[PDB]
């Protein structure tokens, strides 16, 4: 557990890390869209979500 901490500090910032140093959550999670790819919002629904977003309202009775 000492040589792995040195390797994790060595591959810190590297685009390509060894397979054993990558997060092993499960085979289904590793093939999901990352936070960057799922937050991508196309230029059409960016304008639609800007001026047609549901507002906070209330009804008297």
């Amino acid at each position: 557990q000492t040589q792995k901490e040195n390797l994790r500090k060595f591959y810190k910032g590297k685009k390509y890390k060894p397979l054993d140093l990558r997060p092993k959550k499960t085979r289904a999670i590793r093939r999901q869209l990352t936070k960057h790819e799922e937050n991508l919002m196309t230029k059409k629904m960016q304008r639609k979500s800007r001026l047609y977003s549901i507002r906070k309202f209330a009804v008297k009775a």
Partner: protein, 202 residues
């Protein structure tokens, strides 16, 4: 120009298309059964079915043996009642185009089938082109209008009756024509109409 292409491909009996469908069907039957095409033979039809010029979109030509289904029984002996003595005039319950896309999406497991279309005909074979998508290419995962196919629920969508060519055989729709599949599939409707709903206060 795509307007002039979809209207030209409707004159399949004219001298221009009858010659092209004669030379290409000859060329298609000289190659293998599953042969990747470098580009869509019908660019107008591909775009119409969801194809783009991005990286990760591939096209495969599939040659399927056209004709009905012969029941695989030894020496044509279906041991049973004369209702099921038919071996010859038996038709597959799924489209022949749906067989071409299932045959292409299985050989390429790492890709998801999008759609397929008709490119050639013959007396023995039918030729199609299957549009597949590499759901792990960055040009496809970084497009919000294409991330829907990268989900795990679309795994092998062409062999569950989800593509346009295979969804027709399920016989679903809206209206008096399609009462058999009210509830999704015909087996979901059949299961609901046969469950004995034993209420708690009946």
């Amino acid at each position: 120009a795509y307007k002039y292409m979809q209207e030209l491909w409707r004159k399949k009996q004219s001298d221009v298309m009858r010659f092209l469908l004669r030379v290409r069907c000859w060329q298609y039957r000289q190659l293998s059964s599953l042969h990747r095409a470098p580009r869509p033979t019908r660019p107008d039809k591909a775009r119409r079915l969801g194809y783009k010029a991005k990286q990760g979109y591939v096209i495969y030509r599939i040659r399927v043996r056209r004709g009905g289904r012969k029941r695989p029984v030894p020496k044509g002996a279906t041991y049973g009642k004369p209702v099921h003595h038919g071996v010859n005039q038996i038709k597959f319950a799924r489209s022949l185009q749906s067989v071409a896309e299932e045959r292409a999406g299985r050989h390429c497991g790492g890709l998801r089938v999008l759609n397929s279309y008709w490119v050639g005909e013959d007396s023995t074979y039918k030729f199609f082109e299957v549009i597949l998508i590499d759901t792990f290419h960055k040009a496809i995962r970084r497009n919000p209008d294409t991330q829907w196919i990268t989900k795990a629920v679309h795994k092998h969508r062409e062999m569950r009756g989800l593509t346009s060519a295979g969804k027709k055989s399920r016989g679903l729709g809206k209206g008096h024509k399609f009462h058999l599949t009210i509830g999704g599939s015909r087996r979901a409707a059949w299961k609901r109409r046969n469950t004995l709903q034993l209420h708690r206060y009946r």
